[PDB]
Amino acid sequence: TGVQDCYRGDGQSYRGTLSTTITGRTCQSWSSMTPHWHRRIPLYYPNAGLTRNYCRNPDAEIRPWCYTMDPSVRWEYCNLTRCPVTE
Ligand SMILES: O=C(O)[C@@H](Cc1ccccc1)[C@H]1CCNC1
């Protein structure tokens, strides 16, 4: 058996609710500008599902990511694995 939650391709299609980074930090809400001010917002990325603080990939990084709630760490890849391509 595989995982319950995972991304496919580069994860631009990911619409799950994972909200922690590879180091366990909490993702910052996309609509919030604190601790990090940014432009990965629906104004610029209207198709990308930038909702709550869920891991997403609006700008075609290699895998899903988020800004973090740690003021010293702007962004990280999320703690999300790639869905098995095969059985
Ligand atoms: O830090 C950011 O907001 C951007 C890059 C950026 C830095 C400075 C100015 C504009 C863009 C990253 C987040 C993950 N993908 C690109």
Author numbering: -4 to 82
Please quote the paper that reports this structure.
Lipoprotein(a) (Lp(a)), an independent, causal cardiovascular risk factor, is a lipoprotein particle that is formed by the interaction of a low-density lipoprotein (LDL) particle and apolipoprotein(a) (apo(a)). Lp(a) is a lipoprotein particle that is formed by a two-step process involving interactions between a LDL particle and another protein, apo(a). The goal of our research was to develop a potent and selective orally delivered small-molecule therapeutic to inhibit the formation of Lp(a) by blocking the first interaction between apo(a) and apoB to reduce the circulating levels of Lp(a). In summary, we report the discovery and optimization of potent and selective small-molecule inhibitors of Lp(a) formation by exploiting the repeated KIV domain structure of apo(a) through compound multivalency.
